[model samples]
Target: HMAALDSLSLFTSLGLSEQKARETLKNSALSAQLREAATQAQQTLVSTIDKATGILLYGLASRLRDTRRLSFLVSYIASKKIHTEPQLSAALEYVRSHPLDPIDTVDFERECGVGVIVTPEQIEEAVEAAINRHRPQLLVERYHFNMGLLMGEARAVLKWADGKMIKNEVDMQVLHLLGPKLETLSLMEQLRGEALKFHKPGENYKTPGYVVTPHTMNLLKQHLEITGGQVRTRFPPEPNGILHIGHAKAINFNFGYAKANNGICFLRFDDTNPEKEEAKFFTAICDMVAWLGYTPYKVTYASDYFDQLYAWAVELIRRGLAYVCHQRGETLPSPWRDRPMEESLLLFEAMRKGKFSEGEATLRMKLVMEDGKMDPVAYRVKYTPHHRTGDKWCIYPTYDYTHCLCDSIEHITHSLCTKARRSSYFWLCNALDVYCPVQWEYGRLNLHYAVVSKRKILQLVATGAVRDWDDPRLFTLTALRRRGFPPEAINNFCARVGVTVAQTTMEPHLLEACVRDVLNDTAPRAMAVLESLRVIITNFPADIQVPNFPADETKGFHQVPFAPIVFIERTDFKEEPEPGFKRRHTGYVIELQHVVKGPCVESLEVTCRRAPKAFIHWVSQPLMCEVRLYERLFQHKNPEDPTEVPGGFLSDLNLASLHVVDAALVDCSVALAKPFDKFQFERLGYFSVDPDSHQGKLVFNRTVTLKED
Candidate 1:
């Protein structure tokens, strides 16, 4: 039979084209794959086509190409619960159902050189009327366009067909929408050095985390085309602790400001000391800056330019500006030791050539002799091998001596740091009399409610109190990185604080507030019931399951697997009401807003309700697993404060400040939760699935609480 079928020619009796049947048989899998793809593709194409249709109907066909703009349009439609093809089609149909006769009772009488005048007050009045009359489509499409009616020019000219001055409001609105495009064009015209071109007024205000838009780009184009000497800047970080949330302000302010001004910002690690520095710390610093999106114009180590600094030192050395001295004994006589210049230079050179052991002798800057006392110790005797240059040098230069010299070598324009080191600033200024960058100090962000102290944190790591530097409890950037706060959010929050010229501690709530604001707009909303009590819907049928909940619009009574009982927040059902409480109580015929079906009606009430005497997150007990919650480690306003009362928060040395409640009603769905997944844990608070989660096992960290203002 197969052979006969293969031998058959055009089988007309089969009512199928022989060639088509043969082609389908030859490529069945490919055809199926293509058909499936095309089905999804059709849906995609319809979506794209519908977007175009909405653009035309909304009279924003020009901006319709903008994905974000189109998304908002789709959101507006979806908000009205119009998701089905029929609903969307019906709404679109109604928009142009009674299309205006391409004309309105508009009167145009031009008496001046060239301008269209519509009474501004009258147009606004009409717009308000249109809004109140539920004619938003008309107002947005038509009356909004009328703002140009009183302007100097509109998109349209006098069309003989209309026999009236027809204003193409769409084109005019497009011009308004394309303000940046038009500005770019104007910039190009100006660049040509042609006729005098007018530029738009620039925005002149400061805000945190917001990028200076193409307004500055246009300004730079104009300035560069007409001027010489490109603008430049610098980012200088001391080789101390790894960069944290605190340093981010200066980081962005430097890099962001430089980019805004069309300049270059360099990253100078300011690493001159070998005693307290580490290659690990330096690498971490570079990664931190890069993570914050501030790649320096060049990678430079202050130690790398030790020779240039040495040359400058020699210039000072020959001029009797510096001398070697030993001032280690108690009650040292001002480190001068009365050393001759020739002898001092020789000793300094020998020390530079690793001819010294630890703390044997030191080089003193000739500041005191020129001013008051002889001088200060500008270099120390340390036989320790430098992490960068190794044992090539032994006498490491003092911070004051190396700081400014390095900044000058790098052509740093701005030197930013916390205002704690006033002595270093004085010494640095005294060391380098010329080639100094502007010093701007800002208060460090010391977050309250947590122990982020570098000294104490390192101690904790050393003593095995915490796992490592990147432990979740530490305030280090690596720790925060593990905690799942996006780098952008961290930088954004830091940028918001701007620069501080003094040392100040910040409230943790403010940081939390900033995080909340940024996340609320972008994060997808989800729900989880915790601390819940069982509510058996006796009327509901057997093991029914509610599928996925709607995200955009509040979908009505999700038909869950008809179970006799369900779990709700234990706090929601109080056995007795508080002074002014309004939750579920005995005999209160309350309405479950949205439950088994659509939203509960005002007429439909749940009166036959009773408590099981106990309110707990109703987990099908043996089915629930233990989940962890985290809180702050410190109980004081400032853990590092010097003055303290006996037996206070500082008195407690416990790192696990969080209270664990294994009584969490683990939502079965959470068994599949992955790291960084977030959910609203009902009345308890918001939680994030930590990296420690596994199948049928869960550990959620408290991300935030619900008491937001």
Candidate 2:
């Protein structure tokens, strides 16, 4: 029974409530099984005991009323092999007297033959100590190894770590070092947030930890030796659409890894399709990278190497490695596949001189094409003017052709891309004679109830399904930024998700949780109301100063006008309160929180009536503003999953995702808030000043609800 009690206590400490533990322990079948296991343990100990020890065992059985305690004693005696009567008697007497004593694993192991393994709390302490010894420089150096192992170990030990102690230790360790002072610190911060986040009270880690896996650790060690400890990475984004949150992972991986290794990460624009590419996208991509807490070592475009690529195509033609193919059908052996090299070269020249239409001809590599793999389309004739090259060239190299070649030209040591492109990348890189960068692939970031496809997003923008590319409802980086999401939060989310080849369609809450974690400590407090519910405070101070950040005194306070007439959120008041609704109502006294003791007035024009059950926030001489609240764009978790809706993702669209409250009221100080300024609107939710806010008109975007509805 003592052993059962100890186990129950342990479970409770690990987050299970006492009631749940009791209920589980009271299960008749499970209890019977546990009793049987204990009896077996006791029998095993008795079998090992001699006549002298047998007397002690007899006494232990007599003194211990609970089968569980007898089991603990049996396990203990068997482990220590206490043959002497005195030795056995002493241990049995100790257990008999200390019925409620905390189980001393070390003492138990010393008396018993069994070995005592370390507890999770102990492991956490050890890891914390090791990390502290290294501190700020620790994460950057550790990132070189497979973070999977480190995170895995931490996760395994979290059950015993309990509460916020272990997690807080890690947070302190990571934040102290990586917080915001260094660029390399961002990845570490994100990983800590994510690793801790995934280990909820009853859940196991769903993803790999940041600590390097054994295979990766060995590989990294080998790589360092081979590359002289230098890493060259690239963040290659197509310049046809704005960067989205999903792109942050790629950017962080490429940039963070390089910076950690004291190497280089290039921000290369994959502008192979000049028809869709635009100069504005290129600028936006660069700006986003910087905003995401990284500065590209070099900003280069695929178009910049167009001339070199064209020359390579010519060389391939001369070597019979490629040919001009007009065949566009699905037939394996193209009719133009056997064309003469000399004639193919001539046609290629003419193709480059605008002699052919967009799809008239394509420079194809003469290689064995495989199903589900890139066969390699080397070049295509496109008369469309490029953003960078203008009309200088009529032909453009394909992504497969330009990607690896550009990587080779830039001397990129690691070519990181989404897993979908891995097979194609390998085939193309191997087909060419050029030195290929080591290709690495990671799973693309996908969120439930959301789609990141550029075409889909563009469609939404064009059709006015969403406001624009930067619409708060969209996941585009620009939209998130406009809606007051910090770049650090985005990077943190990416980091926490970790770089893995395992694809997942994570719940949107995971992303929002990261945002909340970052904003909870950073965003200042303010009062705002979407709908005015007037509460006349007949007895109030004229100069009331509400703590700007009630939880943080260092942030100081802000002035409140505190007038006889004040505006509260419309939903905060109810003429008929619900069972648990403890807010201001008729005949209820509520403390005005730092202002004055007050009672809810029956009418806005009248004085206080009586005591209140709850408190609320109010703004005096409030400025009228427009607030836009955004929700999931799609009704279903997987909008693109055709099985969910036969009509497609469009039909799954959440038409009521955006709700506009044009008559919202806020404190006068809020009117002075600049664009992208974030604040916790008291009880309402976190909101940011939208760019739409002009001279006299104020606009706000609800970043996220205070908590999930």
Best by TM-score: 2
- Model 2 per-residue lDDT tens digits across residues 441-503: 677777777787878778888888987788887878888899889888887777665656557
TM-score of 2: 0.64
Quote each prediction's TM-score: 0.55, 0.64
**Per-candidate clashes, comma-separated:** 16, 23
Model 1 lDDT tens row, 1-709 = 2112331231211233566445544555533332332233234344332332322222222223222233323433323333333334333433344244331212111211112334433433443343344434434454344444422222122211111222232233233232222121222122221121211112111222213443444543443332222333567676666666666666776676655544457776666777556667667888888877777867677789777777777666777767777666332365354567788888888877767766677777665432344466667777766768887766667776676666545544444565544444444434444433444455666666556566766776786656677666556776665554556677667545554543666776666665665545443333345454554332422322323432444433222222334445544424344664343211223334332323421121232354333322332222354555555555554544544553543455556544565745555555556777665543355566667676657666665565556
What is the RMSD of candidate 2? 16.0
How high is the CA lDDT of each candidate model?
Answer: 0.49, 0.65
Relative to the unseen true structure, what is the Cα RMSD of model 1?
23.6
Alpha carbon lDDT of residue 507, candidate 2?
Answer: 82
